[PDB]
Amino acid sequence: NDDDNTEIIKSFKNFILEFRLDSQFIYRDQLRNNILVKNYSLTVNMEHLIGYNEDIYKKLSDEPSDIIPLFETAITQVAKRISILSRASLPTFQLILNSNANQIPLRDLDSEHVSKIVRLSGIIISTSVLSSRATYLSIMCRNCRHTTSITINNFNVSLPRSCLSNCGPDPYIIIHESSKFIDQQFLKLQEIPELVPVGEMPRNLTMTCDRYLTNKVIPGTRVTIVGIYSIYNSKNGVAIRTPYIKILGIQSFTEEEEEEFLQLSRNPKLYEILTNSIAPSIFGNEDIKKAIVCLLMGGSKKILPDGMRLRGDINVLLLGDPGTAKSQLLKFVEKVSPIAVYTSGKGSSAAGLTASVQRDPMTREFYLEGGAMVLADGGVVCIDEFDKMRDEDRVAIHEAMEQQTISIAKAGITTVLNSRT
Amino acid sequence: DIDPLREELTLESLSNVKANSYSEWITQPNVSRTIARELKSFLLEYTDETGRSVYGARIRTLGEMNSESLEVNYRHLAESKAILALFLAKCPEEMLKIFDLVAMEATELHYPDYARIHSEIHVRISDFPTIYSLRELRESNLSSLVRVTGVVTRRTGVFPQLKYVKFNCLKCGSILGPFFQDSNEEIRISFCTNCKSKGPFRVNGEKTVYRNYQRVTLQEAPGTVPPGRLPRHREVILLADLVDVSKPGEEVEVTGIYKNNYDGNLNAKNGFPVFATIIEANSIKRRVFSWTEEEEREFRKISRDRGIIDKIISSMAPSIYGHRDIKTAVACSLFGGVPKNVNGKHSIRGDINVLLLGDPGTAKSQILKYVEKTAHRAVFATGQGASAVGLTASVRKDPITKEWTLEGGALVLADKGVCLIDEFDKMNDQDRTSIHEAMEQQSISISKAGIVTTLQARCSIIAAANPNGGRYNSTLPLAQNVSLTEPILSRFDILCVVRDLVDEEADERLATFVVDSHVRSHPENLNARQRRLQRQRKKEEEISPIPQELLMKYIHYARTKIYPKLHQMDMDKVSRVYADLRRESISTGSFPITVRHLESILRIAESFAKMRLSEFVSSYDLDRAIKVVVDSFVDAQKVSVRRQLRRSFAIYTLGH
Amino acid sequence: ADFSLTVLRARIALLATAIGGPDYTPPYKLGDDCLACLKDLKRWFKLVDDQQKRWDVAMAVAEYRILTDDLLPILIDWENKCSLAAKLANKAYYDKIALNCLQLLVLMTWPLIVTEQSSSNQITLYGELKKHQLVYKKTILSMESGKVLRAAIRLALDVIKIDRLSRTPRDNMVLKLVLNFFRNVIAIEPGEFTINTKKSMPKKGITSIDTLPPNVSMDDISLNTVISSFHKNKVFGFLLTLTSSLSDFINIPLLEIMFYFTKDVNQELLFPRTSAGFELSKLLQKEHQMRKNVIKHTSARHSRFGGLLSIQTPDKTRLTVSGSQALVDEKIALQKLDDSKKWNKRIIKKEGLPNSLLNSQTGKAIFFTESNGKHFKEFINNFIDSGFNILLHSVTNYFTTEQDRMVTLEQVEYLLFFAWFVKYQLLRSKIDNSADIKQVSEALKEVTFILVSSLLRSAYDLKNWTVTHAGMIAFNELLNLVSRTKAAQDIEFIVSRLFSDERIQLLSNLPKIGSKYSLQFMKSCIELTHSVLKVLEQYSVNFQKVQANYMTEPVIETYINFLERFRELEDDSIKKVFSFFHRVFVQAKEQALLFRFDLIILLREMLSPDGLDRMSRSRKYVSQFSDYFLARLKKRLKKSPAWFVGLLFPPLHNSEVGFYQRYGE
Amino acid sequence: VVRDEEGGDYTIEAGALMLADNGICCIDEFDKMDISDQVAIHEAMEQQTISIAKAGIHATLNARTSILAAANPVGGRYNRKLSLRGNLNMTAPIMSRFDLF
Amino acid sequence: SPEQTERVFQISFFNLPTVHRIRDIRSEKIGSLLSISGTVTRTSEVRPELYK
DNA sequence: GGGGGGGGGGGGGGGGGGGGGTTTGGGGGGGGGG
DNA sequence: CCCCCCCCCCACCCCCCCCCCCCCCCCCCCCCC
Ligand SMILES: Nc1ncnc2c1ncn2[C@@H]1O[C@H](COP(=O)(O)OP(=O)(O)NP(=O)(O)O)[C@@H](O)[C@H]1O
Ligand SMILES: Nc1ncnc2c1ncn2[C@@H]1O[C@H](COP(=O)(O)OP(=O)(O)NP(=O)(O)O)[C@@H](O)[C@H]1O
Ligand SMILES: [Mg+2]
Numbered sequence A: 001n002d003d004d005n006t007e008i009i010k011s012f013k014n015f016i017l018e019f020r021l022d023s024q025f026i027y028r029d030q031l032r033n034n035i036l037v038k039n040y041s042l043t044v045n046m047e048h049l050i051g052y053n054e055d056i057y058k059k060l061s062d063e064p065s066d067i068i069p070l071f072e073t074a075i076t077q078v079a080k081r082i083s084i085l086s087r088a089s090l091p092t093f094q095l096i097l098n099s100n101a102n103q104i105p106l107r108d109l110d111s112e113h114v115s116k117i118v119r120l121s122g123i124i125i126s127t128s129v130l131s132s133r134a135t136y137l138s139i140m141c142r143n144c145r146h147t148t149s150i151t152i153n154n155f156n157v158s159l160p161r162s163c164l165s166n167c168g169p170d171p172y173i174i175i176h177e178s179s180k181f182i183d184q185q186f187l188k189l190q191e192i193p194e195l196v197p198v199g200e201m202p203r204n205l206t207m208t209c210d211r212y213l214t215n216k217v218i219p220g221t222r223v224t225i226v227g228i229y230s231i232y233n234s235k236n237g238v239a240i241r242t243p244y245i246k247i248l249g250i251q252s253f254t255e256e257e258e259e260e261f262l263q264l265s266r267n268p269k270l271y272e273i274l275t276n277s278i279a280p281s282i283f284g285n286e287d288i289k290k291a292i293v294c295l296l297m298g299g300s301k302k303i304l305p306d307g308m309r310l311r312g313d314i315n316v317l318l319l320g321d322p323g324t325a326k327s328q329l330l331k332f333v334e335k336v337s338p339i340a341v342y343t344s345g346k347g348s349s350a351a352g353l354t355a356s357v358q359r360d361p362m363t364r365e366f367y368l369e370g371g372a373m374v375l376a377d378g379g380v381v382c383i384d385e386f387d388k389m390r391d392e393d394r395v396a397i398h399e400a401m402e403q404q405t406i407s408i409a410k411a412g413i414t415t416v417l418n419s420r421t
Numbered sequence B: 001d002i003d004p005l006r007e008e009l010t011l012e013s014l015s016n017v018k019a020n021s022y023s024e025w026i027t028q029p030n031v032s033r034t035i036a037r038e039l040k041s042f043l044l045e046y047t048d049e050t051g052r053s054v055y056g057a058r059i060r061t062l063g064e065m066n067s068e069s070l071e072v073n074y075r076h077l078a079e080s081k082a083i084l085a086l087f088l089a090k091c092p093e094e095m096l097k098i099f100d101l102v103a104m105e106a107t108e109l110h111y112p113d114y115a116r117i118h119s120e121i122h123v124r125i126s127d128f129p130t131i132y133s134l135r136e137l138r139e140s141n142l143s144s145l146v147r148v149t150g151v152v153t154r155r156t157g158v159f160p161q162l163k164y165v166k167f168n169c170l171k172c173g174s175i176l177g178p179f180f181q182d183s184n185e186e187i188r189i190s191f192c193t194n195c196k197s198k199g200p201f202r203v204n205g206e207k208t209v210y211r212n213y214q215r216v217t218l219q220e221a222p223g224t225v226p227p228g229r230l231p232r233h234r235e236v237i238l239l240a241d242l243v244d245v246s247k248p249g250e251e252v253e254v255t256g257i258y259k260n261n262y263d264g265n266l267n268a269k270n271g272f273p274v275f276a277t278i279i280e281a282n283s284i285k286r287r288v289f290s291w292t293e294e295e296e297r298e299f300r301k302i303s304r305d306r307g308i309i310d311k312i313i314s315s316m317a318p319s320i321y322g323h324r325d326i327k328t329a330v331a332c333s334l335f336g337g338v339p340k341n342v343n344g345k346h347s348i349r350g351d352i353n354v355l356l357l358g359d360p361g362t363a364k365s366q367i368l369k370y371v372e373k374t375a376h377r378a379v380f381a382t383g384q385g386a387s388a389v390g391l392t393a394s395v396r397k398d399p400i401t402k403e404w405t406l407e408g409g410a411l412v413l414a415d416k417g418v419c420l421i422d423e424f425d426k427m428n429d430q431d432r433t434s435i436h437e438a439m440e441q442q443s444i445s446i447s448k449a450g451i452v453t454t455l456q457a458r459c460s461i462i463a464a465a466n467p468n469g470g471r472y473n474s475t476l477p478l479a480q481n482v483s484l485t486e487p488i489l490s491r492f493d494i495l496c497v498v499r500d501l502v503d504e505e506a507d508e509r510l511a512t513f514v515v516d517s518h519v520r521s522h523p524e525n526l527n528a529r530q531r532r533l534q535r536q537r538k539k540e541e542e543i544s545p546i547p548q549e550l551l552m553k554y555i556h557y558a559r560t561k562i563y564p565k566l567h568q569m570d571m572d573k574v575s576r577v578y579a580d581l582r583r584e585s586i587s588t589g590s591f592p593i594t595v596r597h598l599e600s601i602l603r604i605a606e607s608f609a610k611m612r613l614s615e616f617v618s619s620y621d622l623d624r625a626i627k628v629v630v631d632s633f634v635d636a637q638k639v640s641v642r643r644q645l646r647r648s649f650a651i652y653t654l655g656h
Numbered sequence C: 001a002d003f004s005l006t007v008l009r010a011r012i013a014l015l016a017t018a019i020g021g022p023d024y025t026p027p028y029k030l031g032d033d034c035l036a037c038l039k040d041l042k043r044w045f046k047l048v049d050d051q052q053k054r055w056d057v058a059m060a061v062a063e064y065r066i067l068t069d070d071l072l073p074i075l076i077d078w079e080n081k082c083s084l085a086a087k088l089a090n091k092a093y094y095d096k097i098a099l100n101c102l103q104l105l106v107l108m109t110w111p112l113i114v115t116e117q118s119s120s121n122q123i124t125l126y127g128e129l130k131k132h133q134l135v136y137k138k139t140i141l142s143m144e145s146g147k148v149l150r151a152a153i154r155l156a157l158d159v160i161k162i163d164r165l166s167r168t169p170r171d172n173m174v175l176k177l178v179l180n181f182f183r184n185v186i187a188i189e190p191g192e193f194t195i196n197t198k199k200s201m202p203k204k205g206i207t208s209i210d211t212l213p214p215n216v217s218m219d220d221i222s223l224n225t226v227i228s229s230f231h232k233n234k235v236f237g238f239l240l241t242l243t244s245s246l247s248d249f250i251n252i253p254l255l256e257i258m259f260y261f262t263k264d265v266n267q268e269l270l271f272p273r274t275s276a277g278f279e280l281s282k283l284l285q286k287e288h289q290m291r292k293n294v295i296k297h298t299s300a301r302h303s304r305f306g307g308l309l310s311i312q313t314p315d316k317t318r319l320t321v322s323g324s325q326a327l328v329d330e331k332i333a334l335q336k337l338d339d340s341k342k343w344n345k346r347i348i349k350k351e352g353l354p355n356s357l358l359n360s361q362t363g364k365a366i367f368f369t370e371s372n373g374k375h376f377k378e379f380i381n382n383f384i385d386s387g388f389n390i391l392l393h394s395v396t397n398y399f400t401t402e403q404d405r406m407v408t409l410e411q412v413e414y415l416l417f418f419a420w421f422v423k424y425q426l427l428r429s430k431i432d433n434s435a436d437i438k439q440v441s442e443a444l445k446e447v448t449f450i451l452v453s454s455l456l457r458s459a460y461d462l463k464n465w466t467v468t469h470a471g472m473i474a475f476n477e478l479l480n481l482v483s484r485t486k487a488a489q490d491i492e493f494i495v496s497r498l499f500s501d502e503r504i505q506l507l508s509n510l511p512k513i514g515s516k517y518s519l520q521f522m523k524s525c526i527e528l529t530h531s532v533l534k535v536l537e538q539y540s541v542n543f544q545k546v547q548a549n550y551m552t553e554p555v556i557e558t559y560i561n562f563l564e565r566f567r568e569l570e571d572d573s574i575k576k577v578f579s580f581f582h583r584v585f586v587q588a589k590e591q592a593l594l595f596r597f598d599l600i601i602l603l604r605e606m607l608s609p610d611g612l613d614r615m616s617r618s619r620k621y622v623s624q625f626s627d628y629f630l631a632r633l634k635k636r637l638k639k640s641p642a643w644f645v646g647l648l649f650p651p652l653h654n655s656e657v658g659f660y661q662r663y664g665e
Numbered sequence D: 001v002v003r004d005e006e007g008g009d010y011t012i013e014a015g016a017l018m019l020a021d022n023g024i025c026c027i028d029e030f031d032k033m034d035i036s037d038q039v040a041i042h043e044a045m046e047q048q049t050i051s052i053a054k055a056g057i058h059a060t061l062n063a064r065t066s067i068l069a070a071a072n073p074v075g076g077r078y079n080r081k082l083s084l085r086g087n088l089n090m091t092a093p094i095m096s097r098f099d100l101f
Numbered sequence E: 001s002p003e004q005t006e007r008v009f010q011i012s013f014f015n016l017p018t019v020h021r022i023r024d025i026r027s028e029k030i031g032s033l034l035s036i037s038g039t040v041t042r043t044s045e046v047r048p049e050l051y052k
Numbered sequence F: 001g002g003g004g005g006g007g008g009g010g011g012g013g014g015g016g017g018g019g020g021g022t023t024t025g026g027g028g029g030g031g032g033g034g
Numbered sequence G: 001c002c003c004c005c006c007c008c009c010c011a012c013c014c015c016c017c018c019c020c021c022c023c024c025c026c027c028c029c030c031c032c033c
């Protein structure tokens, strides 16, 4: 079937080389421009792949785990053909997908979607540290030192069971100098809160991304994911499998919003406009709204010659009578502020506020996970009904609120976290 | 005489079982082919008394829903071809495979190419007559079909599980034919059938297919387990269409197969060859509010009576005499207002919160117990029986995954419902303070053990409380009658004050009503079963202007379908009412009139319009809403001032 | 291909539904064409399983339960029809389906054998097929107290009514098939667990030999149920009047039934020779002796308490053992040292007939219920008092002919019949003077002796050890009877010269060979030898000449190897061994032949505290023998210290020193 | 509400008013019980249930018990010059739940 | 007819001469019939033991 | 007629291959302060 | 006296082992002396 794979590869090569709209070869341009800035990926809109030849899209969507590596390979070959004079070295290019297929909500994904390309959305609630996955393994036999290699496509390999021509039962080892690796990151996606069924607890998926999709999102961001709904046999029922998504695309200043915000800065009535625009259904409380605008913007953070650093963040306490719209103002600020977290004082614990220990079900090893203050870093933590908070929690607020740090010594993990809040 | 691939038997031959076990008889191929023809004939020819084919209509509906499940009523199979009902009871694992093939055949006949929509059909065995409690199951039930009652105590995630799986031998020509995965054990391949030897094995990645899987811990109902015993439980396993049909903290009725399997762990820790067991569910039912098109038309018909509001309010807790303001507040809460969100920026509570504050022996607890039976989603909690987390939400470290997960409290379970809190005055304030967010912002914002999230908690809270010291004292204002503070009291946006005054003509009518109600409830007091139901109906009509069975469906319909609008409401009427109520509420001990009480008038007017099934709120709804709120405020006062306040506010109420 | 097997099973399943079923309007009701269906099923047995040697139909018929779920209902309802009709006198047709049901029962209960001639399919299917026959036997004996048994006798009675000549070949055959039915129902027995020996044994042996099917207990299969159902259907009355009426086409099956009734039951169990609790107390006291014995052989303190004994030998060297009891008893220390050796001498090993007294364990007994005991003993009593001599004459006067063609099974069952009833009547006549030895006079009629001699001689010449053992038993009972009638008295002197010369030699050669064969073989050799010696002594051609033929070393090996089972032997058997030793050693005085260490070992083990019963009469005989034996061994060693070496070995067949070794001058 | 030694998760653990369901509950020194616990039995005495919401476990367990309470008056010695109101530390919520004194 | 399994039989003794305490457990009484007393602290789930 | 030698079965040893081996939250009990 | 706090309790190599194969020993049978 290698001739058939070669014809798939040549079909994709022709798609890169031939696809054109309104006199522009958009994917030749995008691939060249991506090479110039030294990001080795290509973002493909599958509307265009469908429009070019739907047979290719049918092959892709029938079995993406086999077809995606061939498309990546085709991109590498075209990349060389449009950036190197051959007869006078680049890595395996990442494919990135844009799509407008109808979204499957995160709760409805089940066994009939296994290995299909899927489009969904949710809130990223955690983002693991980066990790190294192999693309090319250089391999050696422990006894005879017969060397071979594994070239890997990360869509789901293992070391060979015995020597490929006594030589021992299980003999192969990796040569870590010649082997090539890539960045891999794990994310947890929670379903959109306004899509949760009545009385249900919100459900979530573990999911993975690599190369130029790592570090592209932070916790709390609302995203649409394109990826392969897929399976792996975890260590922790019977004949059961853990579901996960292999991400193929993410969607979450522009050169004219630059102009819009210059024009809005130039408006003389700006402060009144923003003041009116805070919680517009709440009548009155004019000075409080003005102060909320100040808290949103913040002062200016500073560093002195000594290395000492000075707070830019403003803290505001609204203490007062019932039904004065305090909670309504906090629940508005959690909407408008670009980073924000909302908690209530009686819902809190010191751990869930500063940071907590976790044991990752995937590695099965410890890692530290951020609480509300960390998730609010760079923005506002809205602590509603703050007077109901326990004393130890209010103690735990002090470092994160004034020193703007959290110092940690838990499970042997000594650590200090930042809390610009 | 006949082709061995088509030899088939008579029905009396099927009654004349002559293999040893039932399963040995079902698996005899002539018997199997006969059974297939038998069940096909059953589905195509069993009818309603109208002559309409039952499973013709159910299959038509199955395809319209694109469903994978067909609900076969067992009582129908017991009425015709009852031997098949016997085999289905005694040997369900074999029979259901046959019946699934037959059901797919029947629907493929009804809809050509339904194989494109689902490659399989599962029959759901509804109305199985014999029932067991979890304590009641035994060895003699093993591999039998069973119907069990319990509450879902712990529900796991919706995992994929292998269904049909070809395997690869890593020696020789690899592929092995497709094994069928059960709910109980891993597949074993003792030897590879090609090389007839041992070797390593691996799942074939091309020819394998998955189904949904979900275990559930099912446990004895607390209103069933006898005293002096630990409640018993079993691991239910749900497959395919049955996953997430239920959520924890709810009663279910479970048709399934009670199956055992070997487990080295159980043998290890117990020291005997003792097997584990499950209930592989075949069907799940939650355990009234569902309604028909004629019932819909009935709701429309009765609603346009201009007296419907008072007939509903009289119907509320019908065996409770008097207390018409309580019944009004309960009606308003149980229908609720309309929740809103302006441009997505400003969400507004739709729920109406009611506090019943008053003397001992004034039916406050019984009113809550009535609503517990009457509402669609509801839960009931009392005093020191509650905790803050047990009320809103909680977290636990899952013993399977070792990760932290939330578990919903009462106000999550009662989401879109009503929550009933008895002895509100004698909860700890460190529990009471948890109510604030869910009661007004309609949410719970946990930040614990790395979990940081906001849950929806759309509940109307109805609470019952005794005043300070033991009973009400109208010489005092409200703030000295009760220990509760202004924030929590302001959230209860109707207050009912209940007093046990000695009053001869009221007490005689009350006492007569209570005695009449007691004898009307005594145990000893068109067949025999239907005849006593007809007498029961007339007994209910002795006190209730509409049936409770009708009222519950009417409530659920009005809640879920009807969304009133305040089209051309009298703004200045309401505004003057709020202005005067605020001015007279300057008395520092009185009920704290607040903006949320103005919203209460608007929510209540919507709730009355909801009782009328009305798209628009009338002046009469708004006038009644004003009158309710004004009365609630006026009676929250020390008696030295109540007459003057009544006289002042009469200009607003006595127009109606 | 197995496609054929599933097609065959589908066919037999369809036939199973054609036979009939219960009618709800519960009674069993026959199907349409039911007679033709029964004939077609008989034809399936012939067409496939017999003609192709398969037993596949015999498996399929059991899978679809035709015998239990159709045939016995048909027969029992037909029995009730004919019974009620007899009291109140289209049966012409229903008689036919009853007969064909009986034919099918005879087929499906037909005894199973496996040989080198059996097909691979047959020997593969043998086990589960036997199990199904056991379920059949249970159902036949149990159902309605076995009313189908009365159905069978009624079917036979409806041809016994007509004249001796009027019984056509079909009627003769029908009576023979009824006898084969009763024979088969007696004869079904649990199969042997037969294991492949290509693959080695695991670290544990076979987990269990139990081969019963799950719906059967062994008591369902036991003789007790047979006796009860045969009595409650008067099958015993049928057989008794049948054998009385004999005045011979059916004679061989009729003999065979009595063989199958007798093959595994011991005569003494029919004679006594709070009672149950009293005897249980006796039994418990007897095994409490073994409890105090093992307690003497047990440490007073915990297993980890063990110090070390050292046995310094008579030489300046030391051994070591951990036994706390052995630490104060060197006997235990020595024998425990010997027990500790990992090495053993490897020992080498060592069918178309049923289990019997020929091959059972020597203590086996049928534990009758007393009602069944009375019914069985009175049935065989009345048989002896009527049917014995006539039947034995008929069948032995057959077996005078066709000896060359007599199948091995037929030979052994005839010999066992002879032995069993002769032994029973001798025992009953020892117990009752009312019982007469002349009531088995046919045994002594000279044709019988001649035939039994021909059987044993030919079996031994052919080296047919099975039939040789059977004839050895039959000879023992013939000689036993001869001694009784010699005391009770002409024919005695006739047999006491007819058995001369080569017969004396043959009888002398069985106990030479017996050491190579099983315990029961050896036991029958010892029994025969004791009978032979008492017979010859009772007569006393020359007495010294004959006994010299027995007193030779392989006979002593056979007696020793028999005696090696001493704990498992019975007191009377040990008495017979030691009476033989009394003759050889005390009377014949060939003492040198017993001065060998194997006997010394065995004597110590049986005289040990954990040896014989302290109160045993046989222990008294052993003690008496041992006292004299040790005295003579001491005397011979004192006269001849070379025997300290010679004690280890076989004696010197070199005569020139052998005489000196034997007598010492 | 407790942790199960077998399953490890939470469970209901039966108190005396459950063991006395369809039975009788006898309390000595009832007046010397904490008000924390006197306000606890209020549901069982009248609605004849124990309703619980704790640790993520929710229940309404049956408490159909007749209660028999041995009480001492205030200060231990009775004084019939006072009302039964004054002779007891109880209050109307609990005294109304008792049928007769 | 469908095969009815063989019935199992339990021989429940009662009214023994004496009650031994838990503290009187002594291993020579292994395999002997006794009567015993104590208070039950917990009771297991009822499970099927594989008998035969 | 007994002893040696040839042939076949059965058992034991030796080698080779394989698999196994602490933090966070919650309730209830118990003790101390207003 | 009552309520709050805080304390407790709980969730890659080497050894053992087993399987497979080959040789050696011991018995039986036949021939020779
Ligand atoms: N100035 C206002 N303009 C408009 N709506 C208001 C105003 N003040 C209060 N409300 C309404 O009244 C409610 C205020 O709720 P909330 O935000 O919880 O007040 P609060 O200050 O938090 N009181 P509390 O939660 O008891 O501390 C909302 O439903 C608002 O719509
Ligand atoms: N108006 C009434 N109609 C019928 N029954 C009534 C009425 N008032 C009181 N009762 C009876 O009073 C009993 C106790 O009612 P309950 O619900 O406990 O009142 P309560 O106000 O909640 N008392 P408490 O629990 O001390 O606050 C019930 O059995 C009712 O039947
Ligand atoms: Mg607030």
Ligand SMILES: [Mg+2]
Residues within 6 Å of the ligand: B363, B364, B365, B366, B422, B423, B464
């Ligand atoms: Mg109450």
Ligand SMILES: [Zn+2]
Residues within 6 Å of the ligand: A141, A142, A143, A144, A145, A146, A163, A164, A165, A167, A171
């Ligand atoms: Zn190698």
Ligand SMILES: [Zn+2]
Residues within 6 Å of the ligand: B169, B170, B171, B172, B173, B174, B192, B193, B194, B195, B196, B197, B199
């Ligand atoms: Zn293989």
